[PDB]
């Protein structure tokens, strides 16, 4: 009876879709049965069918999105979805390399006049 993300992951895309439609369909059958009295036993299902749907749905979207950023991995210009969202400001920080660029000048000083480790009283 139970659908569990576990197994879905591997399955082929067309299969998953069928499984979703099959649920969607059931869910209409229930909601009609909710209207007509139907039975209590059915109006549990209505909740279960929902998440079972949402589950399929999610897993679909996941697989799809993995496969997107498998594709775009390496590409310079990637879509905004797949771009990393830290925080407005935090994407306008300097570029990890850029903030530790020295000027030729500043290196010359770091070569010639470095901090020595030292003590006093001997």
């Amino acid at each position: 009876a139970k659908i569990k993300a576990r197994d879905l992951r591997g399955k082929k895309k067309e299969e998953l879709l069928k499984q979703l439609d099959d649920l969607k369909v059931e869910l209409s059958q229930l909601r009609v049965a909710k209207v007509t009295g139907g039975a209590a036993s059915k109006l549990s299902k209505i909740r279960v069918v929902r998440k079972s749907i949402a589950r399929v749905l999610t897993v679909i979207n996941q697989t799809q999105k993995e496969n997107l950023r498998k594709f775009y991995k390496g590409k310079k210009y990637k879509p905004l979805d797949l771009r990393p969202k830290k925080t407005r400001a935090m994407r306008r920080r300097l570029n990890k390399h850029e903030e530790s660029l020295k000027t030729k000048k500043q290196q010359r000083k770091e070569r010639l006049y470095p901090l020595r480790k030292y003590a006093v009283k001997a």
Partner: protein, 59 residues
């Protein structure tokens, strides 16, 4: 029916039609004082309405 209020008549006529292997004459919306778009859906003469009803679950 009670329908998603975002629906046209065109969407309902082609939604119904898909689900119930049925052919509609004319959809005919209204909005309930509630948030529900209730569509009245005339079926084309060759199909019955009582028959389909039993098929779907109501009666």
């Amino acid at each position: 029916f009670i329908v998603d209020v975002k629906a046209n008549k065109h969407q309902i006529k082609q939604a119904v039609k898909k689900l119930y292997d049925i052919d509609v004459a004319k959809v005919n919306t209204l909005i309930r004082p509630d948030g529900e778009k209730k569509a009245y859906v005339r079926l084309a003469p060759d199909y019955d309405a009582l028959d389909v009803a039993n098929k779907i679950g109501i009666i």
